[PDB]
Amino acid sequence: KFQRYQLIMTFHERPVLPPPLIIFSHMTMIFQHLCCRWRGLKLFITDDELKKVHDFEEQCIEEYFREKDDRFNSSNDERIRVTSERVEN
Amino acid sequence: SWIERAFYKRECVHIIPSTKDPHRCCCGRLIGQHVWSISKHTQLSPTDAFGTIEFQGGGHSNKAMYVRVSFDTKPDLLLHLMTKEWQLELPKLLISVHGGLQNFELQPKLKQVFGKGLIKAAMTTGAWIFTGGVNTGVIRHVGDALKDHASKSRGKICTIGIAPWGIVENQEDLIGRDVVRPYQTMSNPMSKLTVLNSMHSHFILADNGTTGKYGAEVKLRRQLEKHISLQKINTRIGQGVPVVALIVEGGPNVISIVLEYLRDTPPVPVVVCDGSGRASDILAFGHKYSEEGGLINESLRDQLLVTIQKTFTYTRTQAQHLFIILMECMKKKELITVFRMGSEGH
Amino acid sequence: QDIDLAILTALLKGANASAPDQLSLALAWNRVDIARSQIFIYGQQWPVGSLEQAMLDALVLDRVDFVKLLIENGVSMHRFLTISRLEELYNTRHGPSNTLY
């Protein structure tokens, strides 16, 4: 599941034409590189969806810290502990 | 955008009543902060400030919505700003609250009971909360209660503070239409202009053209609570959205604002609290000792005017007159309510 | 709370200093709740500018609870983060150890 990333990013960068005919796509890239010299799969969302995904992220962060605190405040050990210090008082 | 044409600010063109402080005009604006329509001679200019406050500082920083409005704005259009542009579903219930405008403290047992109370009043129903909005007394303790649910409960409060824009600290910080600024929760201790409570999620800071004094849209908030309660609820089988009023340590004028909500049609029910203080315990010892409402006995009629001469320190004839207001209030006790502290008050 | 609470209170109120001095002692004792109730009293006259310098001294000593305190009072970390002070925070050789060198 980790190696799938490498397999996908190397096959997206590697050209279209198969190895028997890759010399054509190859000379297209060297010819186009010299032609431009003579002359990650990103998503590029704008500033509005930047505002939505940061807001999304704050909601996830707040609920994660909140549920972590609630699982500590509902796990049986803590409840036994709380009951013990309060019966002491 | 649409907000800039739908609502207006008020461009206050004074005749400069210099009076005590020559900068301070009829409304109290600065010497260059010039340019009501009577002797302040304001003239309706378009709205120039609305967006989102991040509330930078104060620990947890929370996005809230602001629009600067004027006072004589169309009320149903204000609800159109509420529901479409700010994206707020219509209230299933409304909880108006009025209290001590001075920054007070309630008793700590009643503090956490009012605190864990008012929020599950909002969370269960999906209630809208109309209130003031700067950190002054009852708003500051509702805001401590709004930190108090934001420790545990997952849901959000749709608490629309309607505070005067004339009591906006740093009016230039949030000025700007469709602009988003983070308002510092840094409150100067000598700032006569008070920071808004960061916990309130929504802000009508309307403005009758004035600076530095309250009451900018208190009459507008009342008639805005009128047209909402005129609109039917989604079931619409004979009812509108209900509006309830809540009074804790209220000031002297909110006795006659209680009498306002009672005398308005339909009579908005009112709750008070006990151990709270000021107006709302003298309408609660009023409520305890009403007998037949306005048929309060003569000795406690005198005990009314003495205690208004002790807390509000009003002259004995006009504190008798505030008893005359109180007797018409307590005659309508059936819409009124008492919260006894724990005890026997439910 | 125990005797430690009220003794720290007593040394923080019979010292009768100004609030910067109060917090500069309080961070040295690291008892953050004593500074939370007392030193950050409701409406207490905290002198201006020392809320930023006390933040600086808090973060150079790894006083995470004092940092959370001053954030909670309203020290803005945006206005706190200057280039020179991020530099000076990167320059310090105090508190814990590190492999920066």
Coordinates of C-alpha atoms in Angstrom, one line a residue:
Chain A
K1 CA 0.0 0.0 0.0
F2 CA 3.0 2.3 0.4
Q3 CA 4.7 1.2 -2.8
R4 CA 1.5 2.1 -4.8
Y5 CA 2.5 5.8 -4.6
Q6 CA 5.9 5.2 -6.3
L7 CA 4.3 3.0 -8.9
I8 CA 1.7 5.7 -9.7
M9 CA 4.0 8.7 -9.7
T10 CA 6.7 7.0 -11.9
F11 CA 4.0 5.8 -14.4
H12 CA 2.4 9.3 -14.6
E13 CA 5.8 10.9 -15.4
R14 CA 6.9 8.2 -17.9
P15 CA 5.6 8.9 -21.4
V16 CA 2.8 7.4 -23.4
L17 CA 4.5 5.5 -26.3
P18 CA 5.7 1.9 -25.3
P19 CA 9.4 1.1 -25.0
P20 CA 9.6 -0.2 -28.7
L21 CA 8.3 3.2 -29.9
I22 CA 9.4 5.3 -27.0
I23 CA 12.2 6.8 -29.1
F24 CA 9.6 8.9 -30.9
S25 CA 8.1 10.3 -27.7
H26 CA 11.7 10.7 -26.4
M27 CA 12.8 12.8 -29.4
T28 CA 9.6 14.8 -28.9
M29 CA 10.8 15.7 -25.4
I30 CA 14.4 16.5 -26.4
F31 CA 13.2 18.4 -29.5
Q32 CA 10.6 20.3 -27.5
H33 CA 13.1 21.0 -24.7
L34 CA 15.5 22.5 -27.3
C35 CA 12.5 24.2 -28.9
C36 CA 11.5 25.9 -25.6
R37 CA 15.2 26.7 -25.0
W38 CA 15.3 28.4 -28.4
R39 CA 11.9 30.1 -28.0
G40 CA 3.0 15.6 -8.1
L41 CA -0.6 15.5 -9.2
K42 CA -1.6 18.8 -7.6
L43 CA -5.2 20.1 -7.3
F44 CA -4.6 23.9 -7.3
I45 CA -7.8 25.0 -5.6
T46 CA -8.4 28.7 -5.2
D47 CA -8.5 30.9 -2.1
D48 CA -12.2 30.1 -1.4
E49 CA -11.8 26.3 -1.2
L50 CA -8.6 27.1 0.7
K51 CA -10.9 28.7 3.3
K52 CA -13.3 25.7 3.3
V53 CA -10.5 23.1 3.7
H54 CA -8.8 25.0 6.5
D55 CA -12.2 25.4 8.2
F56 CA -12.7 21.6 7.6
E57 CA -9.4 21.0 9.2
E58 CA -10.1 23.1 12.3
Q59 CA -13.4 21.2 12.8
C60 CA -11.5 17.9 12.6
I61 CA -8.9 19.1 15.1
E62 CA -11.4 20.4 17.6
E63 CA -13.5 17.3 17.5
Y64 CA -10.4 15.0 17.8
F65 CA -9.1 16.7 20.9
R66 CA -12.6 16.9 22.3
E67 CA -13.3 13.1 21.8
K68 CA -9.8 12.2 23.1
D69 CA -10.6 14.2 26.3
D70 CA -14.1 12.6 26.5
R71 CA -12.6 9.0 26.1
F72 CA -10.2 9.7 28.9
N73 CA -13.1 11.2 31.0
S74 CA -15.3 8.1 30.4
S75 CA -12.8 5.2 30.5
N76 CA -13.3 3.0 33.6
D77 CA -10.0 3.7 35.2
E78 CA -10.5 7.4 35.4
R79 CA -14.1 6.9 36.7
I80 CA -12.8 4.6 39.5
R81 CA -10.1 7.2 40.2
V82 CA -12.6 10.1 40.4
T83 CA -14.9 8.1 42.7
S84 CA -12.0 7.3 45.0
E85 CA -10.8 10.9 45.5
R86 CA -14.4 12.1 46.0
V87 CA -15.3 9.5 48.6
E88 CA -12.0 10.6 50.4
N89 CA -13.4 14.2 50.6
Chain B
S1 CA -22.3 42.9 -2.5
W2 CA -26.1 42.5 -2.2
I3 CA -25.6 43.7 1.4
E4 CA -24.2 47.0 0.3
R5 CA -27.4 47.9 -1.5
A6 CA -30.0 46.3 0.8
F7 CA -28.9 48.1 4.0
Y8 CA -27.4 51.5 4.7
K9 CA -25.1 53.1 7.2
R10 CA -25.9 56.6 8.5
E11 CA -23.5 59.4 7.6
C12 CA -23.8 61.8 10.6
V13 CA -23.5 65.4 9.5
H14 CA -23.6 67.3 12.7
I15 CA -24.1 71.0 13.4
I16 CA -21.3 70.4 16.0
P17 CA -22.7 70.8 19.5
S18 CA -19.3 71.3 21.0
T19 CA -20.7 71.5 24.6
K20 CA -18.2 70.1 27.2
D21 CA -15.6 68.5 24.9
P22 CA -15.4 70.5 21.6
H23 CA -14.4 67.4 19.6
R24 CA -17.6 65.7 20.9
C25 CA -20.6 66.7 18.8
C26 CA -24.3 66.1 19.3
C27 CA -23.5 62.4 19.2
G28 CA -20.0 62.5 20.7
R29 CA -17.9 61.7 17.6
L30 CA -14.4 63.2 17.3
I31 CA -13.8 66.6 15.6
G32 CA -13.0 64.9 12.3
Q33 CA -15.5 62.1 12.7
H34 CA -18.4 64.4 11.7
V35 CA -20.1 64.6 8.2
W36 CA -30.6 61.0 14.3
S37 CA -31.7 63.5 11.6
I38 CA -32.6 66.1 14.3
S39 CA -29.6 68.3 15.4
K40 CA -27.2 65.4 14.5
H41 CA -28.7 65.6 10.9
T42 CA -27.5 62.2 9.7
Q43 CA -28.1 61.2 6.1
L44 CA -28.4 57.6 4.9
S45 CA -25.1 56.5 3.2
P46 CA -24.6 52.9 2.0
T47 CA -23.3 50.1 4.3
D48 CA -19.6 50.0 4.2
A49 CA -18.6 47.2 6.6
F50 CA -19.5 43.5 6.6
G51 CA -17.6 40.3 6.6
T52 CA -16.1 37.8 9.1
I53 CA -14.3 38.4 12.5
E54 CA -11.6 35.8 13.2
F55 CA -11.3 37.0 16.9
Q56 CA -7.6 36.9 17.0
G57 CA -6.4 36.4 20.6
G58 CA -8.4 35.4 23.7
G59 CA -7.2 31.8 23.4
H60 CA -9.5 30.0 21.0
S61 CA -10.0 32.1 17.9
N62 CA -13.5 31.7 16.4
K63 CA -15.0 32.8 13.1
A64 CA -18.1 34.9 13.5
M65 CA -20.2 37.0 11.1
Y66 CA -20.6 40.8 11.2
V67 CA -22.7 43.3 9.3
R68 CA -22.8 47.0 10.2
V69 CA -26.5 48.1 9.8
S70 CA -28.5 51.2 10.5
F71 CA -31.4 51.6 12.9
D72 CA -34.3 52.3 10.6
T73 CA -33.6 49.3 8.4
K74 CA -36.3 47.1 6.9
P75 CA -36.8 44.3 9.5
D76 CA -37.7 41.5 7.1
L77 CA -34.7 42.3 4.9
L78 CA -32.5 41.9 8.0
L79 CA -33.8 38.3 8.3
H80 CA -33.0 37.9 4.6
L81 CA -29.4 38.8 5.5
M82 CA -29.7 36.3 8.3
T83 CA -31.0 33.3 6.3
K84 CA -29.4 33.6 2.8
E85 CA -26.2 35.7 3.0
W86 CA -25.1 34.6 6.4
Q87 CA -26.6 31.0 5.8
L88 CA -28.6 30.7 9.0
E89 CA -31.7 28.3 9.1
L90 CA -34.9 30.0 10.4
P91 CA -35.1 29.8 14.3
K92 CA -37.1 27.0 15.7
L93 CA -37.2 29.1 18.9
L94 CA -36.0 32.6 19.9
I95 CA -34.4 33.4 23.3
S96 CA -34.1 37.2 23.8
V97 CA -32.1 38.2 26.9
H98 CA -31.8 41.6 28.5
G99 CA -29.9 42.2 31.7
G100 CA -27.4 44.4 33.7
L101 CA -25.7 46.6 31.2
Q102 CA -23.1 47.4 33.8
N103 CA -20.5 44.7 34.2
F104 CA -21.6 42.7 37.2
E105 CA -21.2 39.3 38.7
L106 CA -23.9 36.8 39.5
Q107 CA -23.7 34.3 42.4
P108 CA -21.4 31.4 41.4
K109 CA -23.9 28.7 42.0
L110 CA -26.4 30.6 39.8
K111 CA -23.6 31.2 37.4
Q112 CA -23.0 27.6 36.4
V113 CA -26.7 26.8 36.6
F114 CA -27.6 29.7 34.3
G115 CA -24.6 28.7 32.3
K116 CA -25.3 25.0 31.7
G117 CA -29.0 26.0 31.5
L118 CA -29.2 28.5 28.6
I119 CA -27.1 26.5 26.2
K120 CA -29.2 23.3 26.3
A121 CA -32.2 25.7 25.8
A122 CA -30.4 26.5 22.5
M123 CA -29.0 23.1 21.5
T124 CA -32.1 21.1 21.8
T125 CA -34.4 23.2 19.8
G126 CA -31.9 24.9 17.5
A127 CA -32.8 28.2 19.1
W128 CA -31.6 31.5 18.0
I129 CA -30.3 33.7 20.8
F130 CA -30.7 37.5 20.6
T131 CA -28.7 39.5 23.1
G132 CA -26.4 42.5 23.3
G133 CA -22.9 41.6 22.4
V134 CA -20.0 43.6 24.0
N135 CA -18.5 42.1 27.1
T136 CA -20.6 44.0 29.7
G137 CA -22.4 42.0 32.4
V138 CA -25.0 39.6 31.2
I139 CA -23.4 39.3 27.8
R140 CA -20.0 38.6 29.5
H141 CA -21.6 35.8 31.5
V142 CA -23.5 34.3 28.6
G143 CA -20.1 34.5 26.8
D144 CA -18.5 32.6 29.7
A145 CA -21.3 30.1 29.3
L146 CA -20.5 30.0 25.6
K147 CA -16.9 29.0 26.5
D148 CA -18.6 26.6 28.9
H149 CA -20.4 24.6 26.2
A150 CA -17.5 24.9 23.8
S151 CA -15.4 22.7 26.1
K152 CA -17.8 19.7 25.6
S153 CA -20.8 20.0 23.2
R154 CA -20.2 19.3 19.5
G155 CA -23.0 21.5 18.2
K156 CA -22.8 25.2 17.5
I157 CA -24.9 28.1 18.9
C158 CA -26.6 30.4 16.5
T159 CA -26.3 33.3 19.0
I160 CA -26.9 36.6 17.2
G161 CA -25.7 39.4 19.3
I162 CA -27.5 42.6 18.5
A163 CA -25.1 45.2 20.1
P164 CA -24.8 48.9 19.3
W165 CA -22.2 49.8 16.7
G166 CA -21.7 53.0 18.7
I167 CA -20.2 50.6 21.3
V168 CA -17.8 49.0 18.8
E169 CA -14.2 49.1 20.1
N170 CA -12.0 49.9 17.2
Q171 CA -14.6 50.8 14.6
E172 CA -11.8 51.2 12.0
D173 CA -10.7 47.6 12.7
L174 CA -13.9 46.0 11.2
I175 CA -14.7 48.8 8.8
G176 CA -14.7 47.7 5.1
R177 CA -17.4 46.0 3.0
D178 CA -16.8 42.3 2.1
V179 CA -13.5 42.6 4.0
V180 CA -12.4 40.1 6.6
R181 CA -10.4 41.3 9.5
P182 CA -9.4 39.7 12.8
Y183 CA -10.6 41.8 15.7
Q184 CA -8.3 41.9 18.7
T185 CA -9.9 40.6 21.8
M186 CA -7.4 42.8 23.6
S187 CA -9.6 45.0 25.7
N188 CA -8.0 48.1 27.1
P189 CA -9.2 48.6 30.7
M190 CA -9.9 52.3 30.0
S191 CA -11.5 51.7 26.6
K192 CA -14.9 53.4 26.8
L193 CA -15.7 51.4 23.7
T194 CA -16.0 47.7 24.6
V195 CA -14.8 44.6 22.7
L196 CA -17.5 42.2 21.5
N197 CA -17.7 38.8 23.1
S198 CA -15.8 36.5 20.8
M199 CA -18.0 33.5 21.6
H200 CA -21.1 35.0 19.9
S201 CA -21.3 33.6 16.4
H202 CA -23.3 36.3 14.7
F203 CA -23.3 40.2 14.9
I204 CA -25.9 42.8 14.0
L205 CA -23.9 46.0 14.9
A206 CA -26.5 48.4 13.6
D207 CA -26.0 52.1 14.0
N208 CA -28.4 55.0 14.4
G209 CA -25.5 57.3 13.3
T210 CA -24.1 57.8 16.8
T211 CA -20.8 57.1 18.4
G212 CA -20.0 56.4 22.1
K213 CA -23.5 55.8 23.5
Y214 CA -25.8 52.8 23.7
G215 CA -29.4 52.3 22.4
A216 CA -28.4 52.4 18.7
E217 CA -30.9 49.8 17.7
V218 CA -32.7 48.6 20.9
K219 CA -36.0 49.6 19.4
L220 CA -35.0 47.9 16.1
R221 CA -34.2 44.6 17.9
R222 CA -37.7 44.7 19.4
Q223 CA -39.6 45.1 16.1
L224 CA -37.1 42.6 14.5
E225 CA -38.3 40.1 17.1
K226 CA -41.8 41.1 16.1
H227 CA -41.7 40.2 12.4
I228 CA -39.9 36.9 13.1
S229 CA -42.6 35.8 15.5
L230 CA -45.2 36.9 12.9
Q231 CA -43.7 34.3 10.5
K232 CA -45.2 30.8 11.0
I233 CA -43.1 27.9 12.1
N234 CA -42.5 25.1 9.5
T235 CA -45.4 23.0 10.8
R236 CA -47.7 26.1 10.6
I237 CA -50.7 24.4 12.2
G238 CA -51.6 27.7 14.0
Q239 CA -48.4 29.1 15.4
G240 CA -45.3 31.1 14.6
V241 CA -41.8 30.7 16.0
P242 CA -42.0 31.3 19.8
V243 CA -40.0 34.1 21.4
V244 CA -39.2 34.0 25.1
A245 CA -37.4 36.7 27.1
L246 CA -34.9 36.1 29.9
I247 CA -33.9 38.8 32.5
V248 CA -30.9 38.4 34.9
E249 CA -29.8 41.3 37.1
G250 CA -31.7 43.6 34.7
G251 CA -31.2 47.4 34.7
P252 CA -33.9 50.0 35.6
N253 CA -35.2 50.5 32.0
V254 CA -35.7 46.7 31.4
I255 CA -38.5 46.8 33.8
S256 CA -40.4 48.9 31.3
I257 CA -38.9 46.7 28.5
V258 CA -40.4 43.8 30.4
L259 CA -43.6 45.8 30.4
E260 CA -43.0 46.4 26.7
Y261 CA -42.9 42.7 25.8
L262 CA -45.9 42.1 28.0
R263 CA -48.0 44.9 26.4
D264 CA -47.0 43.9 22.9
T265 CA -49.2 41.6 20.9
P266 CA -48.9 38.6 21.4
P267 CA -47.4 38.9 25.0
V268 CA -43.9 37.5 24.9
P269 CA -43.3 35.4 28.1
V270 CA -40.6 36.5 30.4
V271 CA -38.4 34.5 32.9
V272 CA -36.3 36.0 35.7
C273 CA -33.8 34.6 38.2
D274 CA -33.4 34.7 42.0
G275 CA -30.3 35.8 43.8
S276 CA -29.7 37.7 40.5
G277 CA -30.2 41.2 41.8
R278 CA -31.4 44.7 40.8
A279 CA -34.5 44.8 38.7
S280 CA -35.0 41.1 38.3
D281 CA -35.3 40.4 42.1
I282 CA -37.6 43.2 42.7
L283 CA -39.9 41.9 39.9
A284 CA -39.4 38.5 41.6
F285 CA -40.2 39.6 45.1
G286 CA -42.8 41.4 43.2
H287 CA -43.9 38.1 41.7
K288 CA -43.7 36.3 45.0
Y289 CA -45.8 39.0 46.8
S290 CA -48.2 40.1 43.9
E291 CA -51.3 38.6 45.7
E292 CA -53.7 39.4 42.8
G293 CA -51.0 40.8 40.5
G294 CA -51.4 44.6 40.7
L295 CA -53.2 44.1 44.1
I296 CA -49.9 44.2 46.0
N297 CA -50.5 45.1 49.6
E298 CA -49.8 48.7 50.8
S299 CA -46.8 47.9 53.0
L300 CA -44.9 46.0 50.3
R301 CA -46.0 48.8 47.9
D302 CA -43.9 51.1 50.1
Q303 CA -41.2 48.4 50.4
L304 CA -41.0 48.4 46.6
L305 CA -40.2 52.1 46.4
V306 CA -37.6 52.0 49.3
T307 CA -35.6 49.2 47.6
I308 CA -35.7 51.0 44.2
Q309 CA -34.5 53.9 46.2
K310 CA -31.6 51.7 47.5
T311 CA -30.4 49.7 44.5
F312 CA -31.2 52.0 41.6
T313 CA -31.2 54.9 44.2
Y314 CA -34.2 56.6 42.5
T315 CA -36.0 59.5 44.3
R316 CA -38.9 58.2 46.3
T317 CA -41.6 59.7 44.1
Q318 CA -40.2 58.2 40.9
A319 CA -39.3 54.9 42.6
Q320 CA -43.0 54.9 43.6
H321 CA -43.5 55.5 39.8
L322 CA -41.3 52.5 39.1
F323 CA -43.6 50.6 41.4
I324 CA -46.5 51.8 39.2
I325 CA -44.7 50.2 36.3
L326 CA -44.0 47.1 38.4
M327 CA -47.7 46.7 39.4
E328 CA -48.8 46.6 35.7
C329 CA -46.0 44.1 35.1
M330 CA -47.0 41.8 38.0
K331 CA -50.7 42.0 37.1
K332 CA -49.5 40.0 34.0
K333 CA -47.7 37.4 36.1
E334 CA -49.0 34.5 34.1
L335 CA -46.6 35.3 31.2
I336 CA -43.9 36.0 33.8
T337 CA -41.9 33.2 35.4
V338 CA -39.6 32.8 38.4
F339 CA -36.5 30.7 38.6
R340 CA -36.0 30.0 42.3
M341 CA -32.3 28.9 42.8
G342 CA -32.6 25.1 42.6
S343 CA -35.0 24.8 45.6
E344 CA -38.6 24.7 44.3
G345 CA -38.3 26.8 41.1
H346 CA -38.3 23.7 38.8
Chain C
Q1 CA -5.1 23.2 46.9
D2 CA -2.6 23.1 49.8
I3 CA -0.4 25.4 51.8
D4 CA 1.7 26.0 48.7
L5 CA -1.2 27.8 47.1
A6 CA -1.6 30.4 49.8
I7 CA 2.1 30.9 50.5
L8 CA 2.7 31.6 46.8
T9 CA -0.3 34.0 47.1
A10 CA 1.2 35.6 50.1
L11 CA 4.7 36.1 48.5
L12 CA 2.8 37.4 45.4
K13 CA 0.6 40.0 47.3
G14 CA 2.9 41.1 50.1
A15 CA 5.7 41.6 47.6
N16 CA 3.2 44.3 46.2
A17 CA 5.1 44.6 43.0
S18 CA 3.9 45.6 39.5
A19 CA 2.4 42.9 37.3
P20 CA 5.5 42.3 35.1
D21 CA 7.5 41.6 38.2
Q22 CA 4.7 39.4 39.6
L23 CA 4.7 37.2 36.5
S24 CA 8.5 37.1 36.2
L25 CA 8.4 35.6 39.7
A26 CA 5.4 33.4 38.8
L27 CA 7.2 31.8 35.8
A28 CA 10.2 31.1 38.0
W29 CA 8.0 29.2 40.4
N30 CA 6.1 27.6 37.4
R31 CA 2.9 27.3 39.5
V32 CA 0.6 28.6 36.7
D33 CA -2.8 28.5 38.5
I34 CA -1.5 30.8 41.2
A35 CA -0.7 33.3 38.5
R36 CA -4.0 32.5 36.7
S37 CA -6.2 33.5 39.6
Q38 CA -4.2 36.3 41.2
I39 CA -1.8 37.9 38.8
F40 CA -4.4 37.9 36.0
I41 CA -7.1 39.4 38.2
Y42 CA -10.3 40.7 36.6
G43 CA -9.5 44.2 35.3
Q44 CA -6.0 44.2 36.8
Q45 CA -3.8 47.0 35.4
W46 CA -1.3 44.9 33.4
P47 CA 1.3 47.4 32.0
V48 CA 1.5 47.5 28.2
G49 CA 4.3 45.8 26.3
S50 CA 5.3 43.5 29.1
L51 CA 2.8 40.8 28.0
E52 CA 5.0 40.3 24.9
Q53 CA 8.4 40.2 26.8
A54 CA 6.9 37.9 29.4
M55 CA 5.8 35.6 26.5
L56 CA 9.4 35.7 25.3
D57 CA 10.7 34.7 28.7
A58 CA 8.0 32.0 28.9
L59 CA 8.9 30.4 25.6
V60 CA 12.7 30.4 26.3
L61 CA 12.1 28.4 29.5
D62 CA 9.5 25.9 28.1
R63 CA 6.7 27.2 30.3
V64 CA 3.9 25.7 28.1
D65 CA 1.2 26.4 30.7
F66 CA 2.3 30.0 31.0
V67 CA 2.3 30.3 27.2
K68 CA -1.3 28.9 27.2
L69 CA -2.1 31.4 29.9
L70 CA -0.9 34.4 28.1
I71 CA -2.5 33.2 24.8
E72 CA -5.8 32.8 26.8
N73 CA -5.5 36.4 28.2
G74 CA -5.1 37.7 24.7
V75 CA -1.4 37.9 23.7
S76 CA -1.7 37.6 19.9
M77 CA 1.0 35.2 18.6
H78 CA 0.8 37.0 15.2
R79 CA 1.8 40.4 16.8
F80 CA 4.2 38.5 19.0
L81 CA 6.0 36.9 16.1
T82 CA 8.5 39.4 14.8
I83 CA 11.6 38.6 12.7
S84 CA 14.0 39.7 15.4
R85 CA 12.2 37.8 18.1
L86 CA 11.9 34.6 16.1
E87 CA 15.7 35.2 15.6
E88 CA 16.3 35.7 19.3
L89 CA 14.1 32.6 20.1
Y90 CA 16.3 30.7 17.6
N91 CA 19.4 32.1 19.2
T92 CA 18.8 31.1 22.8
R93 CA 21.0 28.4 24.5
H94 CA 18.7 28.2 27.6
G95 CA 16.1 25.8 29.0
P96 CA 16.4 22.3 27.5
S97 CA 19.1 20.9 25.2
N98 CA 19.1 20.5 21.4
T99 CA 21.1 19.5 18.4
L100 CA 21.1 22.9 16.7
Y101 CA 24.8 23.4 17.3

